[PDB]
Amino acid sequence: VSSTIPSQTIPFLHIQKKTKDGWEYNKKLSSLYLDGLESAAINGLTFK
Amino acid sequence: VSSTIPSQTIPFLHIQKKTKDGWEYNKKLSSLYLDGLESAAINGLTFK
């Protein structure tokens, strides 16, 4: 679903990174989080 | 002294404005504050 994130739009759920200006949306971390969410939705998420 | 603020450099003392991204340096408000400080240094500042 990260590839399906549209260009220039910030997803509704997103991981922010810290920079000199402050916290800002990070495409890479948001990609990782959204892919994890997709895997949790399809295969499930384990907490053993 | 505001005119003597160098271009593209943020003064050591400066007023920030609020924007969608957060608090950021504002040339206009920093100009006003620095001019007030210059006047306080030269002529003095009153609190009557």
From Swiss-Prot, chains A, B:
Signal peptide range in chain numbering: none
Family under the similarity heading: Belongs to the thiolase-like superfamily. Fungal fatty acid synthetase subunit alpha family.
Function: Fatty acid synthetase catalyzes the formation of long-chain fatty acids from acetyl-CoA, malonyl-CoA and NADPH. The alpha subunit contains domains for: acyl carrier protein, 3-oxoacyl-[acyl-carrier-protein] reductase, and 3-oxoacyl-[acyl-carrier-protein] synthase.
Subunit structure, as described in the record: [Alpha(6)beta(6)] hexamers of two multifunctional subunits (alpha and beta).
Protein name: Fatty acid synthase subunit alpha
Species whose genome carries this gene: Candida albicans (Yeast)
Species classification: Eukaryota, Fungi, Dikarya, Ascomycota, Saccharomycotina
First-to-last residue of the parent protein present: 630 to 677 of 1885
